[PDB]
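Lecture notes, continued. The same structure-token format from the folding unit now serves as the input rather than the output. Read the line below as a description of shape only.
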């Protein structure tokens, strides 16, 4: 179990002004620290955020958070469930800012909600330094879905923060799961505009080099992995289902069970091909040909394999690669088969 700590800096808040926080399970014998960013979509205007506050309030407020959370998947402390980092210090950072971890705006006379995701990450890091993070060798910033995009948006800022605080020995790395989206055409008209609106509403911030490339008004581009990733300095391992359910949802694709006809077949095959293409120059990546969403905190995350290598193994090979290609220890694992579940190890249900 990971135990809740609300932030001592109570100016760093969830959407409704309640304190943000983190769940922590320390491992005194380890210099590895895993900080996991929870996902859960986002909201981009008053009306949409008001609706989220009615029925997704734990994603907007700490008032009802439990005192503990069980660590699962990569956050598990059991080697059987987590062959990769079972002995690490484990941190789960609840997503309560609804801003894809990009916001830096407080609740105020003019703002019904606070959007402080980027500040939450930095405040968590600062408060952890006194609880052992100061002695870390590796800080792995991981996250799923909106948290995976949050990794891409924040990993270099965490690195810069620790450098400026005087901890140059801590190696900051990223693990972005299910946060690598395509700004593609929908299958039918009903994602780019939502982020453009959100950035303004949240006072959202993006990594500096990416911001300098795209410039004012175009920072929404930095929420798309294939555009922001090449600008990043920190090592980032990208985990992405080729047929991610959230991608298909934003693309207005709903697979019932009737025979898929040619237009949709071509659409789905093209989506997988495009995703594969965007990963070709990502040296640390795990991209199975499955219709699914998220993996790293699922208890059965050990089961999927690409080219016979599981994700925990690929992450271990990545660790080895960052010591100083490895025989039988691959780090770039992208399926080439073109249809969901052409990989036999894909999740079932
Ligand atoms: N460029 C984009 N980044 C994100 C991050 C999270 C998100 O919510 C979802 F549930 F789809 F993951 C959508 C998008 S679009
Ligand atoms: C608390 O957080 C705010 C917002 O990030 C920051 O401006 C302020 O310096 C912090 N105060 C302390 C004591 O850490």
């Amino acid at each position: 179990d990971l135990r809740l700590h609300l932030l001592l800096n109570t100016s760093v808040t969830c959407n409704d002004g309640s304190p943000a926080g983190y769940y922590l399970k320390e491992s005194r014998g380890s210099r590895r620290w895993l900080l996991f960013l929870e996902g859960g979509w986002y909201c981009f205007n008053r009306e949409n955020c008001d609706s989220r506050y009615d029925t997704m309030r734990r994603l907007m407020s700490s008032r009802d958070w439990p005192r503990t959370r069980t660590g699962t998947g990569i956050l598990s402390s059991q080697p059987e469930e987590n062959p990769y980092w079972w002995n690490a210090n484990m941190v789960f950072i609840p997503y309560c800012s609804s801003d894809v971890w990009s916001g830096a705006s407080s609740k105020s006379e003019k703002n019904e909600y606070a959007f402080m995701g980027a500040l939450i990450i930095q405040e968590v890091v600062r408060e952890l330094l006194g609880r052992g993070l100061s002695g870390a060798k590796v800080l792995l910033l991981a996250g799923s879905s909106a948290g995976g995009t949050g990794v891409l948006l924040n990993v270099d800022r965490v690195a810069e923060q620790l450098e400026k605080l005087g901890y140059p020995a801590i190696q900051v790395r990223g693990l972005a799961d299910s946060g690598w989206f395509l700004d593609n055409k929908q299958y039918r008209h009903t994602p780019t505009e939502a982020i453009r609106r959100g950035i303004r509403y949240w006072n959202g911030v993006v990594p500096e080099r990416c911001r300098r490339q795209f410039q004012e008004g175009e920072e929404w581009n930095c929420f798309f992995g294939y555009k922001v990733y090449p600008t990043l300095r920190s090592p980032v391992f990208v985990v992405q289902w080729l047929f991610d359910e959230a991608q298909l949802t934003v693309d207005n694709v709903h697979l019932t069970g009737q025979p898929v006809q040619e237009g949709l077949r071509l659409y789905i095959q093209n989506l997988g091909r495009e995703l594969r293409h965007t990963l070709k120059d990502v040296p640390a990546s795990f991209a199975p040909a499955c219709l699914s969403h998220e993996i790293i905190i699922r208890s059965h995350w050990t089961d999927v394999q690409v080219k016979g290598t599981s994700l925990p193994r690929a992450l271990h090979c990545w660790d080895r690669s960052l010591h100083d290609p490895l025989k039988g220890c691959p780090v770039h694992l992208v399926d080439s088969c073109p249809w969901p579940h052409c990989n036999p190890s894909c999740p079932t249900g």
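Point for the exam: The first strand starts at residue 2 and ends at 6.
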